[PDB]
Amino acid sequence: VPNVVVTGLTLVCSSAPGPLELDLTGDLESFKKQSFVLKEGVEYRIKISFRVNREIVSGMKYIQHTYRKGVKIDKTDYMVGSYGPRAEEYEFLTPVEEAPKGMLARGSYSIKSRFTDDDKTDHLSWEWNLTIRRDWKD
């Protein structure tokens, strides 16, 4: 039973018509074929939920690499702190970003996420997708 268990990802967006959630205790492979529809231009944050079970973990680091048609277009690392063990889950949020906009920016983006720390531990790695559209449904 890992000291750190990563439980979920939530794409936080006030104008999305419904929750945008991944259960990171579930089947991670299935996410590679799924996507969240996001309206072009909207503000959003990424929330990662996790628990720390037995020992203090230091220098926690959340990494997203974003790809378009299998080519990397962005790398972003976030330092998220030092966390002691407790029963209550922890969460952090990435800083607000905006979905891109315009015909040449619409379509799917893949994101390879890794959650690690000072010891370079692979707490969890997973891949998921966004689909940028003019509208949430059409």
**Which structural technique was applied?**
X-ray
User: Which residues have C-beta within 8 Å of that of residue 50, sequence separation ≥ 6?
Assistant: 4, 5, 6, 7, 89, 90, 91, 115, 123
Give φ, ψ of 58 to 5 degrees: -115, 155
Pairing assessment for the beta strands 36-39 and 124-133 based on DSSP bridges: parallel
Which 8-state DSSP code applies to residue 122? -
Yes or no: say if 86 and 53 are a contact pair by the CB < 8 Å rule.
no
Cα gap 15→10, rounded to integer Å:
14
Q: Which two tokens stand for residue 61?
A: 């680091």
The C-alpha angle with vertex 48 and arms to 115 and 133, in degrees rounded to 5, equals 105
Please report the resolution in angstroms.
1.6
Q: Are strands 21-23 and 71-83 parallel, antiparallel or unpaired?
A: unpaired
What are the chain's domains?
1-138 (2.70.50.30)
Residue 134 to residue 97: CA distance in whole angstroms: 17
